[PDB]
Amino acid sequence: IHVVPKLPNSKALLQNGVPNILSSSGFKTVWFDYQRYLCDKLTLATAGQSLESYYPFHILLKTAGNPLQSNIFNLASSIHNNHLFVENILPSAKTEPSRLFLSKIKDSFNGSDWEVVKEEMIYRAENEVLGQGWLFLVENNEKKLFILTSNNNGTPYYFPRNQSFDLNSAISIDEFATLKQMKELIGKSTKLNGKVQDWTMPIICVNLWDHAYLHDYGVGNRSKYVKNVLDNLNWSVVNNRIFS
Amino acid sequence: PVYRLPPLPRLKVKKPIIRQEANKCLVLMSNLLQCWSSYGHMSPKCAGLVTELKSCTSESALGKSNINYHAARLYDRINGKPHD
Amino acid sequence: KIDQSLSKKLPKGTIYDPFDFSMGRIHLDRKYQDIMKSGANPLEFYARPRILSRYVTSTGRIQHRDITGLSAKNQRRLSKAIRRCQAIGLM
Amino acid sequence: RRIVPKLATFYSANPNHEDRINRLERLLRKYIKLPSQAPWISFDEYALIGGGTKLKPTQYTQLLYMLNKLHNIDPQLTNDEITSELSQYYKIKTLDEFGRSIAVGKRKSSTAKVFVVRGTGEILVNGRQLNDYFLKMKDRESIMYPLQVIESVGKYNIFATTSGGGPTGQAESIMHAIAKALVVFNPLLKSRLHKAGVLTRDYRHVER
Amino acid sequence: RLNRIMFENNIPGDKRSQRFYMKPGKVAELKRSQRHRKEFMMGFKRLIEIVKDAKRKGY
Amino acid sequence: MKIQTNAVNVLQRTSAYLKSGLLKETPAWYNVVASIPPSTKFTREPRFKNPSNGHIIGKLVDVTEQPHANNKGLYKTRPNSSDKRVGVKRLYRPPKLTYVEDRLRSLFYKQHPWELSRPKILVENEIGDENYDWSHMLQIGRPLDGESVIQRTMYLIKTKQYGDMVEAYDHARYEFYALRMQEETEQQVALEEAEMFGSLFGVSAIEHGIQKEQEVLDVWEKKVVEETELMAA
Amino acid sequence: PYPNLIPSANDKPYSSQELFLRQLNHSMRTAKLGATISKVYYPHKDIFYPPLPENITVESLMSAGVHLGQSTSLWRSSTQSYIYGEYKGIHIIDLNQTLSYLKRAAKVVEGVSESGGIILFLGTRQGQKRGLEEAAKKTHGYYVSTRWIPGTLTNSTEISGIWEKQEIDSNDNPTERALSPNETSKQVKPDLLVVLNPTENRNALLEAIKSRVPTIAIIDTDSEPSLVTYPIPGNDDSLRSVNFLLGVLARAGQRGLQNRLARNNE
Amino acid sequence: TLAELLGRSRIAQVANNHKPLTYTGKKFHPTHQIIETKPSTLYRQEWGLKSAIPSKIKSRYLVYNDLDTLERITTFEPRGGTQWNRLRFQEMGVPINPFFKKFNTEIIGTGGLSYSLPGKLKNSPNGVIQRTVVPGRILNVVKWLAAIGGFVADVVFFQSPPSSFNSMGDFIRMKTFLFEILEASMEKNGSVSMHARLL
């Protein structure tokens, strides 16, 4: 039985929700209703199996390579990502960005400062993520940050399941080349499961699903919601997520 | 039908039979001899086989049953004797 | 070519496992390789030399119950019917 | 006050060994997540601290397996606990002023001392030409063999000095000494020479 | 194939059986002994099969 | 083995040793075992009721209880042979436990053999923690399996929503079919969406089976060629 | 924290050990995000978080598989009273009798530990070492899991006489006093012996009988109840049931030890 | 009471099955329930059965007959193959209605193999999947039969067999081919008759 995690200051979040991003009704939709929905669906899908004993992150890491249980993976991914998202918008466990994170953004993004990087992430979310999706700021094994976007329920950890390219429409030839090299990397591995190593981790997570913003911000104006999320993050969690 | 043996002093095979695999050199020699029997000695047809033999025996001319142990180990468990 | 005993044939419509395409499957199949078992009376089959002959050797020796696999009752009736067939001039 | 046995394994066959393996298992169990990547005490040495006469070689092999597993943990992630527990169980030639490598080899009762310098393949034996001292071609080829294994024949000058035994013994002593001298000029070739069989003394000798 | 037929019909053993005379009590004793040995062999084969299966499964 | 006296009377032997003076100091267990007497009765106990189905053991219906004729049309006037036999063994045998579900289950996996292929976990988790309302088939903390169908059938019959076993079984079966169709559609659509959004899969079930078949077939190739060579000579 | 580790330069990528520490930091903080797992059985907890004797229900005993008895063909008829019935070719153990006997045995273990007696946990099946060791450590007791040497009790001088002994205070604190050879060579006899597989340990049971050592055991359907002082009807061939019962007994012993220490510290 | 809980226990949930574990006859559908154990319980040999399974077994799936026997062994087999076949069928996508509205023992429609509905097609980034292609192995030199993804089917040819067939002879099963599943039907006895075409 997967159960919705308890959140600090739950009474205040019920009363008002996350300040300056969501109202109480919106926070109910994004977390109290959607997280319960996802957890119940995962429990129904994985009950009576081994996967009931593993956490959603270990579930999605286990299930990433098997086509026929993608649904479980999707649920697991959401159940993880949503919580990550919530944790970077919780009022508290004003928090300030750390020196190390600022240095990494400055070094990772070709000298660009953090705020223009925020605007660039807003642009990326507006452009590529058509409809439901997730936005992440992630660090790779080279100690380099970069911006990743996943369509529907995708994971930053495993690059085969990043779901960063929307094939329903066309794809740029460069995106096709990226897909082909990715598939070659997958195929090179000698493991029977076909697994590959990916040490990417999410430092920032933003929920672009309609549950997050539609009730508070409408069909349009999603970039407004993303800007509000990024401006008022809980920087203690974000700083802790980085390793030194 | 099922036959149940009495409580026996032991459970052992007198002569365990092992599946030694016939040496490759011997069978290759036999094939060569049959070749020269049918086509003839130093016949063009099967001369290739000779080459194989020349290699197969070049280094050397010719190039285990645990049933009793396991039976003795397991007999007390599987004999199905009455309690005491 | 492969001798037929050395090849395993999966019948049509049957499920299988990768083990099936193995010599172990053939060896296992080798290892684990009518009317009188249907509730009938063998004594009634005493003027029927063919069905009685199904249960004897080439020389006419009645087959043991270990070979026939019949019940003791039907085995006794079969032996009696075969001997009666021998006596009456049939078989 | 109360008298009780010291070890939790007191009623086992070898309580000392069981308790020591229990400590090793405890450490191997607490730090199971750490990735991985010098002899140990002898059987009598472990017998003294363990079961003594009760100590068994399988128990000793189990101890060594655990100790090797613990040591094989990556050094950069080891800590003071593992090292402290493991500590209880722990038991160059060069050329001369003239650029010469000096080696001494033996074979049967023959001994040879060889000076190998960089040169053009010239060889002297006891101040005599090689062909004058060694009439047998096989002995000359034996002397050549270590030079041609490293394909440096014609790149060194050899001054060999033999004494004792007969022709073949002296020649093979020159061979072994030349190999030992060549190892100095390029240590990376030692394995190559060692694989050719010229760096191992032929211990065979006349017996009563 | 002919020799196989002969051994399946027990003709060779039968001929040596009829060669000399055997008292009916001794005949019954031998028949009981042979049947008991056959049954014992069947039981021993069953036990060996159980042993081999248990070994395969790791017992 | 005989019922053993010495195991349970250790306290009495130790008391004799202590009072005689043979033993000077009381063992640490003496006071504890005195406070907690061992159970010293080893008796075969009669059983009069089968818990699984409630059948009452040890009851005979007397002649007077039948004032009417039986199915064959005969009045019971004297006891018959079976009635005149003492049945103590029936009391002292452990009763066989029989459940109605055991039948329906056997039916279900006969009707749906491939449902057996779906793996089952027999590790119990916690039995007492189950809090299920069987007005609906799906339960949180439970898989969707045939046992859910039998449980819904028993719930239907218990509430008398349906009268006969077959009717409730069929209704639960149809609910099962609907739910399993929904799950199958989720799986298919999820895989299609993953491929739609760029997900790349290293290996699939067909290719995995093909790989295992290839290893087995290569070993079989070597063994067959060697065996043909062996048999030819 | 992690001595003798050499961090990498910012220009170069992470090292393998740096990646390991980074992933450890991730695991201890964020890997467990999304849901909290409830009502799921984790085997290790049966050893580390056993329930108290009073909190045990029949449902908990049945979940551990304690009720599953031996095959009906291997029945020892002396165990008739402990049997609830037979089902699927095996005998079912009556779990109410199991609960009563287990509570009684837990009280016995708690009393013996509270009196400072020696408790010996003997179990010689394959995977029983972990639970035996943990029970002995938390009860300040002793255990055997490799093999029971015959004569360990009746011939203690020739078996256990050579191993060292130790004087301790009321608080189980070493005194480090030097023991005389006669004191070191005395028999030290267990005050309580608990056997997980009494069928394969007849020697230990007979020695305890001869030496007047009260004994507890898990009595399966094919085991003799009268060979032990405090039988516990239950399944002895399943590791889960054995570990559950052993953890209950070990927690009772730990409670007795804690009561003893609390009284000595007042 | 204890009887109710035993009736609802997972060991009771497994239906009574006593068929031979080692079966050499024709196999059309699963005959034993697959028992799965988690890795954590496998580490301790706990499978939820009466007794501990031997530590030699490394697979997490088995099929069993007796919890206990006179020989003190659990009558089991370390095999979980059949599920994969079922799952592999789901990869084929070929659909096969009794699932829409005294006890009868006939196999009801598809007995849990596939609960899909015929009227759907697969979208792919290349586009609509018109025809489904899966790899298989032609087994014998005979119609010709093929082992395709856990099931044996009769392959419908297209003009002549490729010459590779004649060249290889009885070693034909060594080489993989690509087939398109024309149709899948279920016979009364439970066999799954599929017709495929060698491309």
Ligand SMILES: [Mg+2]
């Ligand atoms: Mg047992």
